[PDB]
Design a protein around this ligand. Structure first.
Ligand SMILES: [Mg+2]
Ligand SMILES: [Mg+2]
Ligand SMILES: [Mg+2]
Ligand SMILES: [Mg+2]
Ligand SMILES: [Mg+2]
Ligand SMILES: [Mg+2]
Ligand SMILES: [Mg+2]
Ligand SMILES: [Mg+2]
Ligand SMILES: [Mg+2]
Ligand SMILES: [Mg+2]
Ligand SMILES: [Mg+2]
Ligand SMILES: [Mg+2]
Ligand SMILES: [Mg+2]
Ligand SMILES: [Mg+2]
Ligand SMILES: [Mg+2]
Ligand SMILES: [Mg+2]
Ligand SMILES: [Mg+2]
Ligand SMILES: [Mg+2]
Ligand SMILES: [Mg+2]
Ligand SMILES: [Mg+2]
Ligand SMILES: [Mg+2]
Ligand SMILES: [Mg+2]
Ligand SMILES: [Mg+2]
Ligand SMILES: [Mg+2]
Ligand SMILES: [Mg+2]
Ligand SMILES: [Mg+2]
Ligand SMILES: [Mg+2]
Lengths: 57, 57, 159, 51, 226, 185, 125, 171
RNA sequence: AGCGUGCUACUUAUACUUCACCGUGAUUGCUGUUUUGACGCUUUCACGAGUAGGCAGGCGUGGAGGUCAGUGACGAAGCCUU
RNA sequence: GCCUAGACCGAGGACUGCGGUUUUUACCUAGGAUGUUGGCAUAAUGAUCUUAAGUCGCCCGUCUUGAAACACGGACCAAGGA
């Protein structure tokens, strides 16, 4: 077997500086508060519901 | 019983062009082999006298 | 039986030109050949001494030796994958000065004259030869030359 | 490490060609041509119709 | 130490940027002038055609001085002379493209390679798209992307080519340094056409194939392949 | 596929290292790898290449060659550099005072050089007194004087030496070497 | 991964390169052998024949020799053999030799646990 | 093919002997201008001691239909090659464009004589102004007064594979 | 769903384009920070079919010099085993 | 010039460069993926083995221009074998 050498370091380098500055989400023109929506997934799939507000999430 | 191929030049230009066809090198002074003996004989004396004159100068 | 003699296959190559048989005009014997001259080789069938082999018929080479009635010519011949230097002794009846020298030597003289005159006039000149370029724009006048319309012709038999 | 197309990346386009900014600002791609309303084929170029 | 060298780097970069501003102004002016002369030449040719039409004459266009040659044939079963010709045109793979300045010598070259290539007269926008998307330079016998004008300057600055637009101009208006600029350009490696070829490539464009001179449809083909 | 205009994956055909496993020659290659990589002096690149050469490509340099090279005009005080062995020459009538840097010296060569007031230094001492090879003069020995080269390119009318074990009148002198025995080539 | 961080480990070929007709004959073992026959469909690479070993399948040099846990495995036969992994406990794991006795293996496991060295075969005897 | 009608004008290259050579025009039915100039030189070397190398193309222009929405009858004079010989023929076509009549002609000789594009020379395309100029009955039958005809047995194309009702062909 | 001809779309090779990884060849730099690997590290680009054949780098076996103060009756070697 | 639908990929790993906006020795989309949320860690995930299904796959070695050949050697296995 090949023994480890002294020059085989274990230090973890820092990541490079990422240039992925986030920009805001752009919603479809059809999504306006007060619009009746149809839920497609989840527990309440198939339910017609009222759209009220666009959260920051 | 032993009738075979007689002659063929097939593949001979391919083999000649793998490493050829190389032109001969040129030099400033060609060999005086085959040049007239009387001329070569006198040209020897002419060069010897020219070398003497340039050496003295 | 195969025959591979010295002059095999030279029936038309070594023939004299039509209505050009007989004695050799003496400018052939008055030309002067110097070592380094470029000469064409063309066997004259009426002189059988100093005759080239059929390979050298039509080849051009450098004079390297001058003897009483002959010149030595250097030819490069392909033998397999390289060239071999061949040294052929030819009587001057089978030799003629190559006309490519006088043209290149004239372009050299013309370039020297144009360059010196351009220097005298203080301008620049480009001496490299150029290939033929595509032609420029132009206007075709139709006064007296209104276009004539052609059509493909019907089929006819003329016998 | 990664080639970016100047025809897609505007930053690379400006890095290579600073004049793209002026071309866009001046609308060179949709420039109108001012000229007179003429028709120079009314005469002998009607040789195209027949000959 | 790292923060110290950062301050020095910041100062040196300040000075470098100040110096580069003038060079970028120069290349900006050059690009604007090239655009002006392109537009003027187009309008001049249009005006000449209209004038010849008015004066009962016929304006004959200047014959094209530039051609873009694309090798559309594979590397198998090529006779020695067109094979050597394609090698001397640097078309040693399928879909390789090169710019050729038309003379008698180059026209007789292209005629030998005609059954294996599609070529034509490229427009300015086609040249620009080729150089921008697939432009590479031959630097120390290596294929280097033309991603910055410094790469072009370091290799063609002795020929007064300082920008990608200088290079494009030198190609388009076949210039005094066309040889150096086009040989610096690595052969363009195009994709296959989006939309395909005609039903059978290897017959002349006149006979419904793809090889030979198509003369302005090289732009549509290049749009397909680039 | 590619239409290859040249052979693919071809090694340069030049030595990039000594074939020798001598550690001290490896140290010399280290020193001149650094000098050639960092001094811009063409001398250091030539010395680095010469340290890779095989034994027949570094023929011995006689002390007579060094004497003749020092007799060039304006070369009397140059440093003679021999990447190889410097041998003695008992045919010299006299040897000058000279500085010579070599891989090896024979006992007679070194004795003569030091006897005449000169120096016999190594290439590492050279790299300190002349790190750019200033005022040096590289001397190489004769390569075509080797005995093996006598038989290279043998053929008709080539004039080279036949590969033969014995020499005498009965060994390859009759037919093909004499017109009285057929032909001569 | 509890080891030094690495890119996701990719094995280009995960099956075993089995010698041709090691399935047909018992005398032909599965150990890979290159077909040298003049007419061989495998040597000539006919469609449908077996894959063959070539350098294209070589592993990424950054993930080569790492087990699925991200460690390089070093064979250990005694407690003094663990000393070479002191400064490499997050990139090298110890594997106790099969011929180590149950006593010495207990000592190796105890010392490896003390040193923080991971052991690839921590259970056997 | 899908064709256009081109006016191609060319001439011999000017010489110091002849500095204004005669201009020759041809009407070429070609898919594009590359084939238009090729066909031009093809017919000029059948009619004159000229080549593309010794000649010059002076003008290429599209000739548009004068009345593209007026129904016409065209007579086309042809010279085509068969498997055995060379024949002259004259045929008639009904169309609103001269180009579309030539396109119909090429389809028609492909269908009735197996004559390919390369085997056909169009000698002449003429719009027949008078109803008496029409010689062929297969186009003369559409020049009768108050022409009416139905289209019996209409086949309707379905979007679906299966149909729940019986097919019909009324129309 | 045949024959002649034109057109549009579409299907897909180990071919072409972009990207990842392996190797080969070339190539950039690395010693007052060379720093216990310089036969090393590192930058960049191109390339990869192969019988006969050549060369290179490796895997495995019996025995020998040296070394691991190596494993082993608390189980060596051998053998069987998703 | 503008708007708009989808797919595959994320190599690199402190900084350094070229540009852009400059409200600024600052910021950016500009020398290669980040942010956020959920679930899981008795498991979603991966590998191998057996088997089914789809698709492809003729018996190796040899001499030969040409072998799956209606050419030759080979029933099987171990040890020896140039
Ligand atoms: Mg034979
Ligand atoms: Mg004759
Ligand atoms: Mg006689
Ligand atoms: Mg598509
Ligand atoms: Mg097709
Ligand atoms: Mg390849
Ligand atoms: Mg004997
Ligand atoms: Mg005798
Ligand atoms: Mg075979
Ligand atoms: Mg059909
Ligand atoms: Mg694919
Ligand atoms: Mg290979
Ligand atoms: Mg082999
Ligand atoms: Mg033994
Ligand atoms: Mg023990
Ligand atoms: Mg055991
Ligand atoms: Mg990454
Ligand atoms: Mg099958
Ligand atoms: Mg046999
Ligand atoms: Mg036999
Ligand atoms: Mg046989
Ligand atoms: Mg067989
Ligand atoms: Mg059979
Ligand atoms: Mg038998
Ligand atoms: Mg037999
Ligand atoms: Mg049997
Ligand atoms: Mg055995």
């Amino acid at each position: 077997q090949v023994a480890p050498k002294w020059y085989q370091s274990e230090d973890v380098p820092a990541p490079k500086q990422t240039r992925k500055t986030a920009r805001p989400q752009k919603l479809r023109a059809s999504l306006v508060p007060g619009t009746v929506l149809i839920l497609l997934a989840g527990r309440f799939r198939g339910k017609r519901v009222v759209y009220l507000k666009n959260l920051e999430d | 019983m032993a009738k075979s191929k007689n002659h063929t030049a097939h593949n001979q230009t391919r083999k000649a062009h793998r490493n050829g066809i190389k032109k001969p090198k040129t030099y400033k002074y060609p060999s005086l082999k085959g040049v007239d003996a009387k001329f070569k004989r006198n040209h020897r004396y002419a060069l010897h006298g020219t070398a003497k004159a340039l050496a003295k100068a | 039986g195969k025959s591979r003699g010295y002059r095999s296959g030279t029936r038309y190559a070594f023939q004299r030109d039509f209505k050009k048989h007989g004695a050799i005009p003496l400018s052939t014997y008055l030309k002067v050949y110097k070592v380094g001259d470029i000469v064409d080789i063309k066997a004259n069938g009426s002189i059988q001494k100093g005759m080239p082999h059929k390979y050298y018929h039509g080849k051009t080479g450098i004079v390297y030796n001058v003897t009483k009635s002959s010149v030595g010519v250097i030819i490069n011949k392909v033998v397999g994958n390289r060239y071999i230097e061949k040294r052929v002794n030819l009587r001057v009846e089978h030799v003629k000065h190559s006309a490519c020298r006088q043209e290149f030597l004239n372009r050299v003289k013309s370039n020297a004259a144009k360059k010196r005159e351009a220097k005298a006039n203080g301008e620049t000149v480009y001496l490299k030869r150029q290939a033929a370029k595509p032609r420029g724009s132009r206007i075709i006048s139709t006064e007296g030359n209104i276009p004539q319309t052609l059509a493909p012709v019907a089929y006819e038999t003329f016998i | 490490v990664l080639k970016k197309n100047p025809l897609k990346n505007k930053q690379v386009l400006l890095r290579l060609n600073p004049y793209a900014k002026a071309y866009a600002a001046e609308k060179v791609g949709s420039a109108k041509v001012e000229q007179a309303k003429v028709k120079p084929s009314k005469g002998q170029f009607a040789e195209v119709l027949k000959n | 130490a790292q923060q110290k060298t950062a301050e020095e780097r910041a100062a040196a970069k300040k000075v470098r940027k100040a110096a580069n501003k003038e060079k970028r102004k120069v290349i900006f002016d050059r690009a604007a002038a090239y655009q002006k002369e392109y537009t003027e030449a187009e309008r001049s040719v249009i005006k000449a055609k209209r004038d010849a039409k008015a004066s009962n004459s016929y304006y004959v266009d200047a014959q094209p001085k530039l051609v873009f040659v694309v090798r559309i044939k594979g590397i198998n079963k090529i006779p020695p002379k067109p094979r050597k010709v394609l090698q001397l045109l640097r078309l040693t793979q399928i879909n390789a493209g090169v710019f050729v300045r038309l003379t008698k010598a180059t026209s007789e070259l292209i005629k030998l390679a005609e059954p294996y290539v599609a070529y034509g007269y490229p427009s300015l926008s086609t040249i620009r798209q080729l150089v921008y998307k697939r432009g590479f330079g031959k630097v120390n016998k290596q294929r280097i992307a033309l991603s910055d004008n410094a790469i072009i300057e370091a290799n063609l600055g002795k020929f007064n080519i300082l920008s990608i637009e200088d290079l494009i101009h030198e190609i388009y208006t076949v210039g005094p340094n066309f040889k150096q600029v086009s040989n610096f350009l690595w052969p363009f490696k195009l994709s296959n056409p989006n939309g395909g070829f005609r039903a059978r490539k290897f017959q002349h464009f006149i006979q419904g194939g793809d090889t030979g001179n198509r003369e302005q449809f090289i732009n549509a083909l290049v749009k397909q392949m680039n | 596929g590619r239409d290859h205009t040249s052979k693919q994956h071809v090694r340069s055909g030049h030595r990039t290292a000594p074939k020798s496993d001598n550690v001290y020659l490896q140290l010399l290659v280290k020193l001149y790898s650094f000098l050639a990589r960092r001094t811009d002096a063409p001398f250091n690149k030539v010395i680095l290449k010469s340290l890779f050469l095989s034994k027949i490509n570094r023929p011995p340099v006689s002390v007579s060659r060094i004497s003749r090279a020092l007799k060039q005009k304006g070369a009397a005080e140059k440093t003679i550099v021999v990447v190889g062995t410097v041998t003695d020459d008992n045919r010299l009538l006299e040897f000058p005072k000279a500085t010579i840097a070599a891989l090896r010296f024979t006992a007679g060569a070194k004795d003569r050089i030091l006897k005449n007031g000169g120096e016999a230094i190594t290439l590492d001492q050279l790299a300190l007194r002349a790190p750019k090879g200033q005022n040096t003069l590289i001397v190489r020995g004769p390569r075509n004087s080797r005995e093996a080269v006598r038989h290279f390119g043998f053929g008709p009318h080539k004039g080279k030496a036949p590969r033969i074990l014995s020499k005498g009148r009965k060994f390859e002198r009759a037919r093909g070497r004499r017109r009285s025995r057929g032909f001569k080539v | 991964a509890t080891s030094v961080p690495h890119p996701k480990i990719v094995k280009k070929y995960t099956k075993k390169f089995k010698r041709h007709h090691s399935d047909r004959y018992h005398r032909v073992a599965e150990n890979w052998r290159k077909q040298k026959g003049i007419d061989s469909c495998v040597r000539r690479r006919f469609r449908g024949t077996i894959p063959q070993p070539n350098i294209g399948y070589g592993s990424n040099k950054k993930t080569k020799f790492l087990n699925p846990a991200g460690y390089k495995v070093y064979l250990v036969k005694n407690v003094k053999d663990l000393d070479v992994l002191l400064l490499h406990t997050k990139s090298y794991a110890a594997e106790i030799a099969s011929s180590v006795s149950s006593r010495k293996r207990v000592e190796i496991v105890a010392k490896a646990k003390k040193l923080g060295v991971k052991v690839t075969n921590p259970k056997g005897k | 093919s899908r064709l256009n009608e081109y006016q191609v004008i060319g001439r011999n290259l000017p010489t110091e002997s002849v500095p204004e050579p005669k201009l020759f025009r041809m009407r070429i039915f070609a898919p594009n201008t590359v084939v238009a100039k090729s066909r031009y030189w093809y017919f000029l070397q059948k009619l004159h001691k000229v080549k593309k190398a010794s000649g010059e193309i002076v003008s290429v222009n599209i000739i548009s239909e004068a009345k593209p929405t007026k129904v016409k009858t065209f007579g086309i004079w042809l010279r085509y090659e068969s498997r055995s010989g060379i024949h002259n023929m004259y045929k008639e076509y009904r169309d609103v464009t001269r180009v579309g009549a030539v396109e119909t002609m090429y389809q028609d000789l492909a269908a009735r004589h197996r004559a390919r594009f390369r085997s056909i020379h169009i000698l002449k395309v003429v719009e027949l102004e008078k109803t008496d100029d029409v010689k062929r009955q297969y186009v003369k039958q559409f020049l009768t007064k108050d022409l009416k005809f139905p289209l019996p047995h209409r086949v309707q194309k379905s979007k679906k594979l299966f149909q729940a009702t019986a097919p019909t062909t009324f129309y």
